[PDB]
């Protein structure tokens, strides 16, 4: 019945396609094949009310034509991997564009560090809920890989959506 337009953004390889396809299919995809961008919808309760999730899946590396989504779209998962440094740094970038091309410092948003089944961290938990906390928004560790976090991440953008809507 109510519908949710969810943008999943960050740098190439951190895991946008494998955590969405964990939230629709069950399944982990091991291979990587880059994304131009995909879309997908599902019918999920949350919270006891039925919400229709419009997922757009973004590539990593753009080519820019970020502004045209970033306006239709009401929540952002911005995801880093929590091996790649420069991942986590790209995010501050993505964040600085939502706002500006919303128009907006309070933008519906939940920051995810991807990835967290792998031994070779870089990106320390202490420092993403210190980032999150200076936004004001929710940090989540997941793992497409073991499905770890991943309702959460995505149910958690919705509550932040949900809050928006009802301030
Ligand atoms: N170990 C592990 N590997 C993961 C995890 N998430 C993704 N991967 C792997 O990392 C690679 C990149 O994953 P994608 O989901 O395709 O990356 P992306 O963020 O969609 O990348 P672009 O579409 O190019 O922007 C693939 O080989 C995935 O199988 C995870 O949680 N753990
Ligand atoms: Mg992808």
Do not use: W
Not at 30 to 37: C, F, K, L, R, S
Not at 69 to 90: H, P, Q, W
């Amino acid at each position: 019945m109510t519908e949710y337009k969810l943008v999943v953004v960050g740098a190439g390889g951190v895991g946008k396609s494998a955590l969405t396809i964990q939230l629709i299919q069950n399944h982990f995809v091991d291979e990587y094949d880059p994304t131009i961008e995909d879309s997908y919808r599902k019918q999920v309760v949350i919270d006891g009310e039925t919400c229709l999730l419009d997922i757009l899946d973004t590539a990593g590396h753009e080519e820019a034509m970020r502004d045209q989504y970033m306006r239709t779209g009401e929540g952002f998962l911005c995801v880093f991997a929590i091996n790649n440094t420069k991942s986590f740094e790209d995010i501050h970038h993505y964040r600085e564009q939502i706002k500006r091309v919303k128009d907006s410092e309070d933008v519906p948003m939940v920051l995810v560090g991807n990835k967290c089944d792998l031994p070779s961290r870089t990106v320390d938990t202490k420092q993403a809920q210190d980032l999150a906390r200076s936004y004001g928004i929710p940090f989540i560790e997941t793992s497409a890989k073991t499905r770890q976090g991943v309702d959460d991440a995505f149910y958690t953008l919705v509550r932040e959506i949900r809050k928006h809507k009802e301030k």
